[PDB]
Design a protein around this nucleic acid. Sequence first.
RNA 1: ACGAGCUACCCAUGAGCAGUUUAAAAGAACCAACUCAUCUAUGUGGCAAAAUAGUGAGAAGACUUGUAGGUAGAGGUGAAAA
RNA 2: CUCGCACACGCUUACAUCAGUAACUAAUAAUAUACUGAUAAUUAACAACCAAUAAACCAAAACAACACUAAAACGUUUAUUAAUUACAUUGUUAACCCAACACAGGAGUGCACCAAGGAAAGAUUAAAAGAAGUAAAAGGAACUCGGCAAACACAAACCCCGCCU
Lengths: 106, 46, 387, 49
Amino acid sequence: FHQRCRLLEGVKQALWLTKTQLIEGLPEKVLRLADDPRNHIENQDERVLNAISHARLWHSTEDIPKRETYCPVIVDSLIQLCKSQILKHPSLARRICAQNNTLSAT
Amino acid sequence: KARGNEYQPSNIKRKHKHGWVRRLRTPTGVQVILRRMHKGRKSLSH
Amino acid sequence: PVARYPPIVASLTAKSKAARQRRVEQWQATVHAAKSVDEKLRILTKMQFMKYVVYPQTFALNADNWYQSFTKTVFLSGLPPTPAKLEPEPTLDITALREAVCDCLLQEHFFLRRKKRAPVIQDREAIASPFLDQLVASLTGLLSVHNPVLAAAALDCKRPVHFFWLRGEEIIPRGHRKGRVDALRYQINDKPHNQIRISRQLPEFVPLDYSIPIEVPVMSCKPDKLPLFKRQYENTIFIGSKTADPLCYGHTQFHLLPDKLKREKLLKQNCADQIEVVFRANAIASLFAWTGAQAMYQGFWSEADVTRPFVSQGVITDGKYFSFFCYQLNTLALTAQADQNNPRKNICWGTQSKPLYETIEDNNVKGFNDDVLLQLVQFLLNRPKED
Amino acid sequence: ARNVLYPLYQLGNPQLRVFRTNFFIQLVRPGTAQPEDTVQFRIPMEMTR
RNA sequence: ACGAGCUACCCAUGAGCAGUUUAAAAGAACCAACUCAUCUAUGUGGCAAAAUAGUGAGAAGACUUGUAGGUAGAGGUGAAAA
RNA sequence: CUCGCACACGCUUACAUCAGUAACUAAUAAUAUACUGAUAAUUAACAACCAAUAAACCAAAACAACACUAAAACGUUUAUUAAUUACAUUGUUAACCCAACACAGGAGUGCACCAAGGAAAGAUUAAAAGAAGUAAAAGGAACUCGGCAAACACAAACCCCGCCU
Ligand SMILES: [K+]
Ligand SMILES: [K+]
Ligand SMILES: [K+]
Ligand SMILES: [K+]
Ligand SMILES: [Mg+2]
Ligand SMILES: [Mg+2]
Ligand SMILES: [Mg+2]
Ligand SMILES: [Mg+2]
Ligand SMILES: [Mg+2]
Ligand SMILES: [Mg+2]
Ligand SMILES: [Mg+2]
Ligand SMILES: [Mg+2]
Ligand SMILES: [Mg+2]
Ligand SMILES: [Mg+2]
Ligand SMILES: [Mg+2]
Ligand SMILES: [Mg+2]
Ligand SMILES: [Mg+2]
Ligand SMILES: [Mg+2]
Ligand SMILES: [Mg+2]
Ligand SMILES: [Mg+2]
Ligand SMILES: [Mg+2]
Ligand SMILES: [Mg+2]
Ligand SMILES: [Mg+2]
Ligand SMILES: [Mg+2]
Ligand SMILES: [Mg+2]
Ligand SMILES: [Mg+2]
Ligand SMILES: [Mg+2]
Ligand SMILES: [Mg+2]
Ligand SMILES: [Mg+2]
Ligand SMILES: [Mg+2]
Ligand SMILES: [Mg+2]
Ligand SMILES: [Mg+2]
Ligand SMILES: [Mg+2]
Ligand SMILES: [Mg+2]
Ligand SMILES: [Mg+2]
Ligand SMILES: [Mg+2]
């Protein structure tokens, strides 16, 4: 199963091949970690509104950017917004990103 | 509606229709080369 | 009871050169009357005449000397003069920074395994490019606690930068427009590896009217001998984002030299002094396009000049050898009819190339230079003045 | 060399060596302005960089 | 024997249609680019072996158009004008 | 007064510097993008040249959120191979091409309508006839095959033949 493999019953086949149980909704640890106002960036509403506009309209000289341009930009822009919380939580420096690694599990 | 300019130049078309390669691919074409060589033409084909 | 003499300006519809100047001065006044900065850029860049295409990463034997003439830039050896301010200096633990940078080197070199490479030549373009992505991200996050500005800044990864300007004049040699005067137009299409943009402008290094004894070199040949080739396409002035973006200023740039400009390639081509030329040529062209684009997004142009100097920083690197540059833009009226009397000049301080690591092998970095790391930290600690 | 038949190259062939070159070079004065380091030559058609 | 570089039709591969009116990109409507050529006047060894000036019809379609290929005279092709 | 810059296709040095034109070329003269002689030139980043097999994948382009009928150009990833070795070769001029002409004709795309490109009159006199344009007393189709043409008009209705584009 590589990246470009399509499954017909995507939720059902993945559940069967992995022997998992689907639970609707994010876990309570994750969900209660975002409802607290003490875990919000400054101007969260405004900056995200700028991130969406920058991703889809501002980042390119053309009037209508194509999807392959604004799909990785919007994700990286949102990563930077939550990366700025390292000053409030000085433990995010333990993270690092990797690109196009080779993974295998049989 | 104003005839006289029927010749629109094109190198791709000229070398594909009257080229040396085409002249040697058909048995009738080779006879055209033979006639022009016998007559003494300076240019057998394009 | 007072005579009212008509003005003595030249005619507007005549064929004479004085009339043509008045026609030119007519559209010059159209830009002034425009309100939105977008409309000013539209009028300046709506004509599509022939222009030279300037590549920041070039193989010309003497590129920095020619690029200075096109830009009116005087290159100063060494780092820019110190701010001479000893306000409370941050305390940074080098061990944490050293470990973070070493982890970036060890990952993309030894730890992170790639797909099998049949050539086995191990192209440095495919290895150093992900290293720069992690190095910028690692240092921006780590230094965010000491510099709050980097938290609010935006990171751009391989985003094009464009600039367009006129310089000097030329008499057309050949064609039906023979003998008529036509200005020389230049274009820079740059793709910086990384960018940091700030809502607030960085402070200046030297005052706007800074008199330097050295002069801009003047070539005695056509630009076609560089070589440079004329081309015609859209004239674009770009900062990495459209004008509506609130982040209209820049902080630093990161550039990666391509495969064709490696140190090993230059040695085989019998090129010794060309190693530093490539670094200098890349910084002068890239930084000027960035600083020039910032000025024109604020409404400043050839007839409005520049009120406050625009400062941007650059870090040209190839994968192992790092160079640091600082650029300050004082002049924007580079047009021949507008540069008749302009004593101001653009200054670009530069640094000699220095290695960062040495013979990294088996998750062990043998050699390491902290001064390069310390210099990189100093660049990322630059902050706008607060009020 | 010009007007000669080069050996066809396959994998592992020996280095190609020419001992008496058939090429001849003219050094000419440039007709336009040239930089200080540029020298202009006239070379036969079968000569590469 | 030689000709589909003009033209009739078709197979590939591309590229154009702004504004205005309407739930409409409806072989709808107003009007340009663009494509045809209704009427009259000049022209008639002429600018032109079929044009110029004014005026006209279509202008999101059965539409115009570039490149290149296919069908050849007892034939090709044709929304038949021999 | 306003069809301007560039690419593709085509043409093939007709381009540039200097000199000469009694005569040849321009439908004339000055003169030289167009005639003669000598010398010189277009430098690659743009453009051409620029891997094969096996496997997974029913889900349109129209700001594409989602739909219509006429059912639609536009590929990624995994696997097995792929000489690995600075600098290869080729197109870069022009006022140009197809029409016997330096022809009021024909000619695809991008961006502007201008900052760019150009000159309707060789010099006179101010006859007829002819062509093109503007204005008019009173009348307003009495002209004529027909309101053809022209107009400060730019509307209304009937009939014949085809349904309509
Ligand atoms: K054919
Ligand atoms: K004509
Ligand atoms: K020619
Ligand atoms: K009658
Ligand atoms: Mg003929
Ligand atoms: Mg044709
Ligand atoms: Mg055809
Ligand atoms: Mg329309
Ligand atoms: Mg219609
Ligand atoms: Mg007409
Ligand atoms: Mg007419
Ligand atoms: Mg009339
Ligand atoms: Mg109509
Ligand atoms: Mg109609
Ligand atoms: Mg045949
Ligand atoms: Mg028949
Ligand atoms: Mg028909
Ligand atoms: Mg009949
Ligand atoms: Mg009949
Ligand atoms: Mg000819
Ligand atoms: Mg003449
Ligand atoms: Mg002369
Ligand atoms: Mg000559
Ligand atoms: Mg004639
Ligand atoms: Mg005249
Ligand atoms: Mg006359
Ligand atoms: Mg008369
Ligand atoms: Mg009248
Ligand atoms: Mg009257
Ligand atoms: Mg009557
Ligand atoms: Mg009568
Ligand atoms: Mg009649
Ligand atoms: Mg009428
Ligand atoms: Mg009747
Ligand atoms: Mg009918
Ligand atoms: Mg009927």
